[PDB]
Symmetry: D2
């Protein structure tokens, strides 16, 4: 739907983010991580602002992967929160939170944080 966001993207780790930005504000696609307790593709879903500001600001968005697929389950989920900055060197700039299922006793060490920059492969 939104042609700028829709496509196949890679981040600095070489993970592959395949997404469609639909007329309804949804992000729908698959994610394949180059790192971590992950193999092959995982379902993702998210949302984006389908009417962004016309003042040069980016388009806010986010999405989630739960790290379960037909062949592995890491008992974990990542959410990416960020913005799409369009134009000739378009980027999706994010920060993310990866929470693993833990006992309450280990909950203090349940969540990793980082940042991913995605560039379109297209």
């Amino acid at each position: 739907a939104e042609a700028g966001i829709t496509g196949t993207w890679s981040n600095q780790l070489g993970s592959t983010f395949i997404v469609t930005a639909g007329a309804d504000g949804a992000l729908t696609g698959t994610y394949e991580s180059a790192v971590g307790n992950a193999e092959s593709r995982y379902v993702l879903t998210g949302r984006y602002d389908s009417a962004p500001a016309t003042d040069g600001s980016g388009t806010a968005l986010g999405w989630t992967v739960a790290w379960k697929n037909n062949s592995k389950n890491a008992h974990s989920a990542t959410t990416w929160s960020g913005q799409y900055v369009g134009g000739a060197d378009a980027k999706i700039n994010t920060q993310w939170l990866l929470t693993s299922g833990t006992t309450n006793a280990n909950a203090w060490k349940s969540t990793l944080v980082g940042h991913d920059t995605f560039t379109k492969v297209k």
Copy 2:
């Protein structure tokens, strides 16, 4: 299955109405008690539909883009956390709220916090 589906509230008084699909999907609406928000917003997310059997929580996350028919804050929040069910269920999360900005102001684009939800 999971016990996630239902109406939840957090420490701010916001309302999270969610349905957990058998496939790992989360769907529903979010209404914030605070910020540049009015009425309900669509959410989508994912959860681990086959959690560990060892007393660990269930990983999950979801997104809201803060545009609805009433208002658009040009921002989006993601919650990442764990669910524990049963009669005193709780969802314990950390969240990232990114506002659209120019690249020069990206350093001040993202708030971080933590929300605890209980079932209403």
Copy 3:
């Protein structure tokens, strides 16, 4: 002045022993109840020594590098948050715990969480 100086504990049972200098400095020791840590570690930090007068909290933060004479976890935590004093004082924080890693593993170097401290 501020009321920060003292012995504090968090929800994990860790102990934060701090002195607030008149110049904005924080000094003292931290003992974690969890993780790759034993005994006391040095901390340093800073706080706003001239906070607003409007009922806002006092911004502060501090660092611990997890090396002492007993153990070295090759990691460091920073807490960033706000202090409210008085008889039921609390320090509400978010924290980032970075472990040294190679560049290939920097994506998994940093834990994030939130600690609430009360005075012992």
Copy 4:
């Protein structure tokens, strides 16, 4: 003291981080931000691992600025948590938390998060 960490660094915003890594594990210096509610230099203090692993891992560290100096007070503090990766293109890679003093009612919006990469000017 530690010559690799000690020096004058700039980040991607053009802020200037002047630091000494002392034999006692302390970081001591000043910070000048290119952005935000800030002017001139602010005191910083922090800590670093003075005996890092010899396996190629970085050197963990962190520091704090409270945004009060002789001429402005933002009623806020930032902490940077990260690691120094030495060698010919040395970097200090961080994530940070900027908490502002707020009322309890506004505490939900008290804290910004981001990431800074510092390169040595020397």
